Amino acid sequence: GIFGAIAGFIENGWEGMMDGWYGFRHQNSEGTGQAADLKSTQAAINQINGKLNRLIEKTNEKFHQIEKEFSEVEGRIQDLEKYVEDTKIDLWSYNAELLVALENQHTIDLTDSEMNKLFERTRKQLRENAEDMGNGCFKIYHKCDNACIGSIRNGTYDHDVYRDEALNNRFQI
Amino acid sequence: GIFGAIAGFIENGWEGMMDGWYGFRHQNSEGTGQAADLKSTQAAINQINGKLNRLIEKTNEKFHQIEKEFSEVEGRIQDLEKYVEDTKIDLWSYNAELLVALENQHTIDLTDSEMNKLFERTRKQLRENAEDMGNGCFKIYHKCDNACIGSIRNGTYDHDVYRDEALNNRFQI
Amino acid sequence: GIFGAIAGFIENGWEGMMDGWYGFRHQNSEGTGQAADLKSTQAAINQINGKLNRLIEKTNEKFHQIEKEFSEVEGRIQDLEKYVEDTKIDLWSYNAELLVALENQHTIDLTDSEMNKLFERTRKQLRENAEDMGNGCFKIYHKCDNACIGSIRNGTYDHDVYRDEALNNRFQI
Amino acid sequence: PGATLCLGHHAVPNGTLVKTITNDQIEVTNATELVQSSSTGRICDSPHQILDGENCTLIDALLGDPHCDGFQNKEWDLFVERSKAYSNCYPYDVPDYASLRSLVASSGTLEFNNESFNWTGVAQNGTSSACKRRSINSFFSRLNWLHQLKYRYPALNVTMPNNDKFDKLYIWGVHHPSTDSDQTSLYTQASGRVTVSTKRSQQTVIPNIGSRPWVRGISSRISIYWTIVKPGDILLINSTGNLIAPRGYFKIRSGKSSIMRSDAPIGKCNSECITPNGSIPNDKPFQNVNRITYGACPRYVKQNTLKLATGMRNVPE
Amino acid sequence: PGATLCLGHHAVPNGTLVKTITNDQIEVTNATELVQSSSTGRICDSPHQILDGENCTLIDALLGDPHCDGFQNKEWDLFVERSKAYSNCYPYDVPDYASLRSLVASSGTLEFNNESFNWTGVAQNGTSSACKRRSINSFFSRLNWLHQLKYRYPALNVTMPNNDKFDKLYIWGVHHPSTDSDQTSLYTQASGRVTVSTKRSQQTVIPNIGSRPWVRGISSRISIYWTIVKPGDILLINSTGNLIAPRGYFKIRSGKSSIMRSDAPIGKCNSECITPNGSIPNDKPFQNVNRITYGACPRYVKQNTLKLATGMRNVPE
Amino acid sequence: PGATLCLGHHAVPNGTLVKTITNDQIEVTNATELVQSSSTGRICDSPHQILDGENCTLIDALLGDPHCDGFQNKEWDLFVERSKAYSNCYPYDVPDYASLRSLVASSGTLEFNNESFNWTGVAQNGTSSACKRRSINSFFSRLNWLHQLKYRYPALNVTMPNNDKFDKLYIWGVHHPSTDSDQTSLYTQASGRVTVSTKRSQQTVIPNIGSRPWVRGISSRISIYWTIVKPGDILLINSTGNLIAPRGYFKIRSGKSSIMRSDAPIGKCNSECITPNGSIPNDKPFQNVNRITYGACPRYVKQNTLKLATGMRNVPE
Ligand SMILES: CC(=O)N[C@H]1[C@H](O[C@@H]2[C@@H](O)[C@H](O)O[C@H](CO)[C@@H]2O)O[C@H](CO)[C@@H](O[C@@H]2O[C@H](CO[C@]3(C(=O)O)C[C@H](O)[C@@H](NC(C)=O)[C@H]([C@H](O)[C@H](O)CO)O3)[C@H](O)[C@H](O)[C@H]2O)[C@@H]1O
Ligand SMILES: CC(=O)N[C@H]1[C@H](O[C@@H]2[C@@H](O)[C@H](O)O[C@H](CO)[C@@H]2O)O[C@H](CO)[C@@H](O[C@@H]2O[C@H](CO[C@]3(C(=O)O)C[C@H](O)[C@@H](NC(C)=O)[C@H]([C@H](O)[C@H](O)CO)O3)[C@H](O)[C@H](O)[C@H]2O)[C@@H]1O
Ligand SMILES: CC(=O)N[C@H]1[C@H](O[C@@H]2[C@@H](O)[C@H](O)O[C@H](CO)[C@@H]2O)O[C@H](CO)[C@@H](O[C@@H]2O[C@H](CO[C@]3(C(=O)O)C[C@H](O)[C@@H](NC(C)=O)[C@H]([C@H](O)[C@H](O)CO)O3)[C@H](O)[C@H](O)[C@H]2O)[C@@H]1O
Ligand SMILES: *[C@@H]1O[C@H](CO)[C@@H](O[C@@H]2O[C@H](CO)[C@@H](O[C@@H]3O[C@H](CO)[C@@H](O)[C@H](O[C@H]4O[C@H](CO)[C@@H](O)[C@H](O)[C@@H]4O)[C@@H]3O)[C@H](O)[C@H]2NC(C)=O)[C@H](O)[C@H]1NC(C)=O
Ligand SMILES: *[C@@H]1O[C@H](CO)[C@@H](O[C@@H]2O[C@H](CO)[C@@H](O[C@@H]3O[C@H](CO)[C@@H](O)[C@H](O[C@H]4O[C@H](CO)[C@@H](O)[C@H](O)[C@@H]4O)[C@@H]3O)[C@H](O)[C@H]2NC(C)=O)[C@H](O)[C@H]1NC(C)=O
Ligand SMILES: *[C@@H]1O[C@H](CO)[C@@H](O[C@@H]2O[C@H](CO)[C@@H](O[C@@H]3O[C@H](CO)[C@@H](O)[C@H](O[C@H]4O[C@H](CO)[C@@H](O)[C@H](O)[C@@H]4O)[C@@H]3O)[C@H](O)[C@H]2NC(C)=O)[C@H](O)[C@H]1NC(C)=O
Ligand SMILES: *[C@@H]1O[C@H](CO)[C@@H](O[C@@H]2O[C@H](CO)[C@@H](O[C@@H]3O[C@H](CO)[C@@H](O)[C@H](O)[C@@H]3O)[C@H](O)[C@H]2NC(C)=O)[C@H](O)[C@H]1NC(C)=O
Ligand SMILES: *[C@@H]1O[C@H](CO)[C@@H](O[C@@H]2O[C@H](CO)[C@@H](O[C@@H]3O[C@H](CO)[C@@H](O)[C@H](O)[C@@H]3O)[C@H](O)[C@H]2NC(C)=O)[C@H](O)[C@H]1NC(C)=O
Ligand SMILES: *[C@@H]1O[C@H](CO)[C@@H](O[C@@H]2O[C@H](CO)[C@@H](O[C@@H]3O[C@H](CO)[C@@H](O)[C@H](O)[C@@H]3O)[C@H](O)[C@H]2NC(C)=O)[C@H](O)[C@H]1NC(C)=O
Ligand SMILES: *[C@@H]1O[C@H](CO)[C@@H](O[C@@H]2O[C@H](CO)[C@@H](O)[C@H](O)[C@H]2NC(C)=O)[C@H](O)[C@H]1NC(C)=O
Ligand SMILES: *[C@@H]1O[C@H](CO)[C@@H](O[C@@H]2O[C@H](CO)[C@@H](O)[C@H](O)[C@H]2NC(C)=O)[C@H](O)[C@H]1NC(C)=O
Ligand SMILES: *[C@@H]1O[C@H](CO)[C@@H](O[C@@H]2O[C@H](CO)[C@@H](O)[C@H](O)[C@H]2NC(C)=O)[C@H](O)[C@H]1NC(C)=O
Ligand SMILES: *[C@@H]1O[C@H](CO)[C@@H](O)[C@H](O)[C@H]1NC(C)=O
Ligand SMILES: *[C@@H]1O[C@H](CO)[C@@H](O)[C@H](O)[C@H]1NC(C)=O
Ligand SMILES: *[C@@H]1O[C@H](CO)[C@@H](O)[C@H](O)[C@H]1NC(C)=O
Ligand SMILES: *[C@@H]1O[C@H](CO)[C@@H](O)[C@H](O)[C@H]1NC(C)=O
């Protein structure tokens, strides 16, 4: 939520996009399409896998320790043995709760970050040929067939080629 | 500070806004006004209340523990009892210091985030009828009475209705 | 990485900038230049020094504690003394690992934040006289000698003075 | 003429200082305190069962010191030991006094069932002027001072099987006479012996004749010991002299019970958290009132105060 | 006619709830569990060396209880004590039983070297019907019951120097006869004494005559003690009666060895982490199966479950 | 022709690797080390008061071993025990040696006030060739070896009241003769006894006759015990033989004092933090030099190194 895109100015996700986490949905004269963006999807997945690798199978080897169950009443020494262990468990329980809370807040923020990065990447690409509609969609002011859409996704779109046409439509009266 | 709005490109806050955390201040031909934005104010407050609920009254029940004050010199066992307790207090003291430091840094960043979100919400709404003056203020290039200001705040502003008028003023020579 | 500037839409850093962390590189008719921006450089350095001051020389005074090396086999009491200490070391070791991980992630994000802030500061300054090329560079659509570049860096650039000239070049056909 | 629309945020004239990762003093609009640093000064008698020891230690209530007779068979969630407490019976010491205090405090009950031990051969119910009940020479309510009968102290051998489902806690003692004549007068033999045992354990005590610093009329001492008999187990007591015998057992439970040292008065109020300074509210997560707590309490920390920002950074006009 | 290009993100119909700093229930597309909360129910015999105690405690294997003769000289990474274990030799107790169990468990070996002690003056190899080997009266394999020879028990004085590089662990005992006639019959003197010592330490035990609750034919007891002799040091044993002598020493190492109480069966599998509930996988960083673990294990926590978000916030269509 | 203005950031050819939440190796422009992993090799004699034990343990200085006479009445912030230390007086052992060492180390002073005990009835000032002062037979400076006078050792009964504001620490002993003739020659009775007591406590020791591994001429031993007398309390010593008597008390404080084992030499330098490896700087928050520290120290951790990023991510040209 820290960038306001996911669960913000984007009203909902696309349950139909199943080859990526972030993508494009276009409508032009040739029809309507949906294609996933890989660089931003891979960027979010790699970061989340990084977290997991720092947590999964990094465990502690312990061997002989202290007794933690008791069949007799003993008093002073047993109290301290129980206290030591109860103190340790509470502290690791706290570490566990905070760890998950922190990581989850960051996972939500970094996925929001990666959405915004893709939005910003596209916005600079389209230069003065398009206008942000405010809901994660750009209005493209020129003829843009599927090969033209593909060049935007692929990052090969020459804005100069359509500038005159878009400027005319953008600033018509 | 992470978005640079609060204590950044906004020079100071408004001590006079007492019905919200974020808002609008306008000047047109009908006069000058101030109105608080609720969705962004509620968004920041709900997040901060979320933090508090995770901290307030979640305490630990403890009953019989170890002794922590001593009237005699005893040596080995007393040293360990003091050490155990002194170790526990230092660790929870550390947890407390880091918790507050982390939470406060995030509280400042999320309030900065919510300011930026409102700025961005408005900027996309005004389309090509306005220009960012750089200090958190937009210059609106058309006649915009109080009902026109209200539609911006309320989110009902049709930019198409004023586009021709604003484009003429924006690109005059 | 959270703002996508450093190691994002900026392809690499400048090894040649040695008087600052963030800066400007321009090309006009008078030549090509490089000058560091102080307010953003000082902003990042002050934040990082703030972290260091919270960590450097804040240590704990301890005097008589428990024994931690043993020459004889003793059993129950020695086991608890070893366990207490081994538990303490593991917990502080964990605190140390998480501290550095958290701080480093934030240091990378705040330096990325400060880069973006400078980019945004410049973008609003240039108003409608320039266009974002998408790689951290602005194309300036008017005659801008070195005194004109200096006014941008210094924050004294009157965009009104060049607006007519830039608007003509921007919207030519 | 156009129009200008400015986006902004609020501010206050009276901000608060908080710490962050990068800054140990930054002003925000509002904050809340996370360290409970004040107490009410009194221990709330609710919602926990508070037992005010008043003039009595727990041990003296256990043993049955006469001015502690009122505490018989009471239970407690928290036993409060006052510094004004005193012992007013036969002078005694307890090897591992601390462990006996903790196990009884933890068990949370003074429930005592009497049991019929076969002390045929010795006189019972010995008394002393150091331990008076309404001016009359008496002894610990829960202990039985056995001495000679017609100048003879036979080898005692008595059994008590635990056929119940619960554990039995037996408290017993050994008299250490000041003089050899006191030894032979009371117990006939030149030196006594006491062996309390079960199937799993044993404790054998040889008395030590010799005077001890005078305490309240006496220069001898009674050493106090304890024995826990499990179900199916049997208590076996032997003595050729100096045995201070138990009159029964205490029930010994496990629960949320404990004991605290404090001179804070008891009040009529409701508070989950108890410190020796008195009850404190548990709305905050941390506290630096006392490292000794009982109940649902904030966790002790060294810090006076820890301010949690509840508002944005403050930038006044 | 133009075109419209929309930027977006994916979503799922079946999201998962996770906790954050600001929210204790927020839906993400996917999550993974961080608390191991299930066990296989069996202890994997790999990769650690598991010693199933079966019917024997570690102490009874150490002493040489006849039905524990199979455990002689075995090593272990983890010794598993079953609740069905029983003692079937001469009844005994051990002062600081727990410390002896821990040091042997920690040492991880039952290796025993025999040593030739000069017991000239007393008969050796005493036996009893409470401790039978194939119906024949016998005794603890590692202990030597010394008694009188032709109605005489001289003052024993035997030395054993540790000239090895390792420490020596000596286990020895004291007989506490039920009756005075049993004392004089076995050891001639009216009361015995045992003193085991080194250059640095000493332990002196006076036996206590008197019966104890009947256990498996006997009403006397043997108290068990231990002594560690360092290199260059000398074991010195003295007795005027009641000495239960060692037949040698145990090697005493330091390693990764320990002991666990569990009735979980042993299985043919490979698992690094052992709990009394059985082996658990160690892929997760936390677990709430048991606070008692052995090996490379997730750390115990109180929580059932802790869900780590592995995907963005979920916003369905 | 226009102009182009590029925003950017710096970079370096020699970046450093750091860990983050999402990455365990990422290059930044600069970093700083947070784990102190080196020592100077010597213990700085400032700002703390260092007492180099040299050839003497703390206990031997306490008791008054002749080659330790120089340590009398010294105070210390940190007592440094060398491995080359040796005992060169009468052979002894100390039940709970560790507790006596810790309480004296913690107290931080060897201050000793002499006191006039009434030993009328016995000879004083016994000596031995195992404890020489300038070739002359002597004894522990702070202990008084009482033995018979004209073949008689009466029942000693001596009192010493603590009428001071501070606690008194009394160190006393028991002689365990090698032979019965040695017992009767020194103390006349066939077996001795020692009882030191206060109003609150008692310690009674029966000596044990019998030889012990030969140490420096002697095969007997002296057992060392201690007693703390509170203000208003009274020290009561009784003996029918074998008492090693105190010549006074030690002051027993509470402070910042302790004791460390190390063979690191003492140097002329200033360093707040002391480890057995020598002083270390305390500029960093963590250290992995030693888990044993004294003073204002970085906290011990298992990690070699922990690099804190002090610069942005590094992206070279
Ligand atoms: C049983 C008794 O009366 N003992 C007293 C003892 O009597 C001796 C007599 O039994 C023997 O046959 O002959 C000699 C010489 O003829 C003695 O007379 O004498 C002691 C010294 O005079 C007394 O000590 C004094 O006791 C005082 C008060 O004593 C009581 C007490 O109140 O504590 C009386 C109690 O009934 C008695 N307990 C029992 C179970 O009989 C206790 C107990 O003997 C002692 O407390 C244990 O040490 O004593 C004063 O305390 C006085 O200061 C003290 O000298 C014997 O009481
Ligand atoms: C050595 C022996 O046989 N002792 C038995 C004792 O014999 C006395 C005799 O030695 C003495 O000179 O004269 C008197 C009177 O004439 C006795 O006869 O008598 C005791 C009571 O009758 C016996 O106790 C009984 O022992 C039974 C089984 O005993 C064994 C055992 O199996 O535990 C036999 C063992 O050989 C013996 N151990 C050694 C090293 O000799 C042990 C040992 O003496 C005891 O276990 C220690 O207390 O006893 C039954 O246990 C029966 O219940 C019990 O009354 C003496 O055994
Ligand atoms: C007091 C004394 O001289 N005792 C020695 C003992 O003398 C006996 C005599 O007192 C008795 O009346 O008659 C018999 C037979 O006629 C003896 O002669 O004899 C022992 C064995 O011969 C000696 O043991 C030897 O002691 C040697 C050195 O002893 C000293 C020492 O330096 O440790 C001398 C000290 O003055 C003495 N301490 C005191 C307070 O008098 C100590 C002390 O007695 C012992 O250290 C305690 O065990 O002994 C050698 O150590 C030799 O190895 C050893 O056999 C008695 O010393
Ligand atoms: C600085 O920030 C703090 C923390 O965010 C903030 O304090 C909070 O204010 C709220 C609302 O005023 C307090 O809520 C009250 O809590 C008590 C119990 O402690 C309730 O009984 C109260 O209930 C009343 O109001 C309810 C409204 O729905 C009714 O349902 C009810 O019947 C009562 O009429 C009330 O909700 C809250 O306790 C504090 N929290 C803390 C930690 O202090 C404070 O407002 C900020 N300071 C400033 C100057 O703005
Ligand atoms: C929710 O998120 C979780 C966590 O991110 C995610 O689960 C992970 O999925 C991966 C890939 O499917 C799992 O990887 C497997 O791990 C096992 C060992 O545990 C490997 O042996 C497997 O190897 C196979 O595939 C490899 C591909 O290179 C081959 O090299 C190999 O020979 C095998 O063919 C496999 O890689 C991973 O275990 C889980 N992680 C966890 C913690 O569960 C899950 O996909 C997400 N859920 C949904 C519904 O999307
Ligand atoms: C990598 O980052 C580290 C950490 O940020 C950075 O190291 C720091 O450099 C500063 C400045 O060079 C060091 O400051 C010095 O500290 C000592 C005490 O340790 C002071 O005595 C020094 O004082 C001198 O300079 C002062 C300037 O005002 C004078 O007042 C004074 O009289 C002296 O002339 C000096 O300030 C600091 O110690 C380090 N910190 C650490 C943790 O090392 C380093 O520069 C970066 N590396 C690179 C290659 O850039
Ligand atoms: C061994 O020495 C101790 C210490 O001197 C002896 O105890 C002392 O005994 C006398 C009387 O015998 C005590 O005096 C009494 O004091 C009380 C109240 O203080 C007074 O009311 C009596 O009338 C009497 O005067 C003295 O205080 C006491 N000292 C202590 C410390 O208890 C002990 O009796 C001696 N034993 C032998 C066998 O000599
Ligand atoms: C001191 O008292 C105890 C307790 O009464 C005595 O022990 C008891 O001794 C009798 C026999 O002397 C035991 O009876 C026996 O029981 C077994 C099996 O239960 C039976 O097979 C025998 O034939 C015999 O009947 C009794 O159970 C036993 N009690 C306990 C608790 O062990 C002890 O002997 C007494 N000592 C003296 C010196 O009087
Ligand atoms: C009980 O047995 C021990 C062990 O044998 C006896 O101690 C031993 O006593 C002899 C002399 O009586 C010692 O020899 C001496 O050695 C020193 C230096 O090593 C030498 O200088 C002497 O001249 C003498 O030869 C022997 O070493 C010693 N052993 C030990 C381990 O101390 C003890 O005396 C016996 N007690 C009885 C009552 O028999
Ligand atoms: C609560 O009571 C404790 C215990 O008496 C107080 O802490 C002691 O304060 C004295 C002087 O005020 C210090 O010298 C002691 O070191 C403290 N005791 C311990 C064990 O550290 C504490 O100040 C009281 N707090 C409140 C809020 O009443
Ligand atoms: C693993 O075994 C432990 C120990 O038996 C189980 O914990 C006990 O559960 C009982 C009732 O089920 C509770 O009354 C006890 O308080 C628990 N013991 C302790 C020491 O807390 C545990 O439930 C088992 N877990 C699994 C997953 O099998
Ligand atoms: C500081 O001294 C300690 C203690 O001697 C050193 O740690 C020991 O190192 C040996 C081998 O070098 C290991 O076998 C031991 O396990 C270590 N001891 C403990 C208690 O773990 C340590 O290496 C020294 N460090 C420095 C920097 O000098
Ligand atoms: C974009 O890349 C895809 C994948 O290789 C390719 O099939 C497509 O033709 C490309 N389109 C353009 C316009 O470059
Ligand atoms: C905006 O909403 C407010 C609140 O209901 C209303 O009073 C006002 O008339 C609205 N104005 C416009 C322009 O929608
Ligand atoms: C910008 O500031 C620098 C530093 O003082 C100065 O040298 C330069 O002349 C200034 N240029 C402009 C255009 O203000
Ligand atoms: C310490 O002992 C050694 C060998 O006994 C000796 O050389 C050295 O001088 C002694 N130093 C002191 C201060 O006693």
Author numbering:
A (entry chain B), B (entry chain B), C (entry chain B): 1 to 173
D (entry chain A), E (entry chain A), F (entry chain A): 9 to 325
Paper text:
IAV strains are named according to the antigenic similarity or serotype of two major viral surface glycoproteins, hemagglutinin (HA or H) and neuraminidase (NA or N), which also play key roles in binding and release, respectively, from receptors on airway epithelial cells. Influenza HAs bind sialic acid (N-Acetylneuraminic acid, NeuAc) containing glycans (sialoglycans) on cell surface glycoproteins and glycolipids as their primary biological receptors. Previously, we and others have demonstrated that over time, IAV HAs within the human H3 subtype have evolved more complex receptor specificity, selecting for elongated α2–6 sialoglycans featuring at least three linear LacNAc (galactose linked β1–4 to N-acetylglucosamine, Galβ1–4GlcNAc) repeats beneath the terminal species-defining sialoside moiety. By utilizing a variety of structural techniques, we provide evidence that this enhanced mode of receptor-binding has evolved over many years to include mutations outside the traditionally defined sialic acid receptor-binding site (RBS).
Co-complex structures of H3s from the 1990s onwards reveal an interesting pattern of redistribution of H-bonds around the terminal sialic acid moiety. The two LacNAc repeats observable in 6SLN2 complexes shift to a position in considerably closer proximity to HA side chains within the 190-helix and 220-loop secondary structural elements. Importantly, this alteration in the positioning of LacNAc sugar residues (a change equivalent to approximately a 30 – 40° shift the positioning of the GAL sugar ring relative to SIA, see C2-C3 bond) appears to have become permanent, with bound ligand conformations observable in essentially matched positions through the following approximately 20 years. The alteration in receptor binding conformation shown in Figures 5C – G is principally contributed by HA variation in the 130- and 220-loops making new H-bonds with galactose and sialic acid. Residues 190 and 193 no longer make H-bonds around the O9 of sialic acid and the second GlcNAc, adapting instead to make new interactions along the sugar chain and giving rise to a slight structural shift in the overall positioning of the 190-helix.
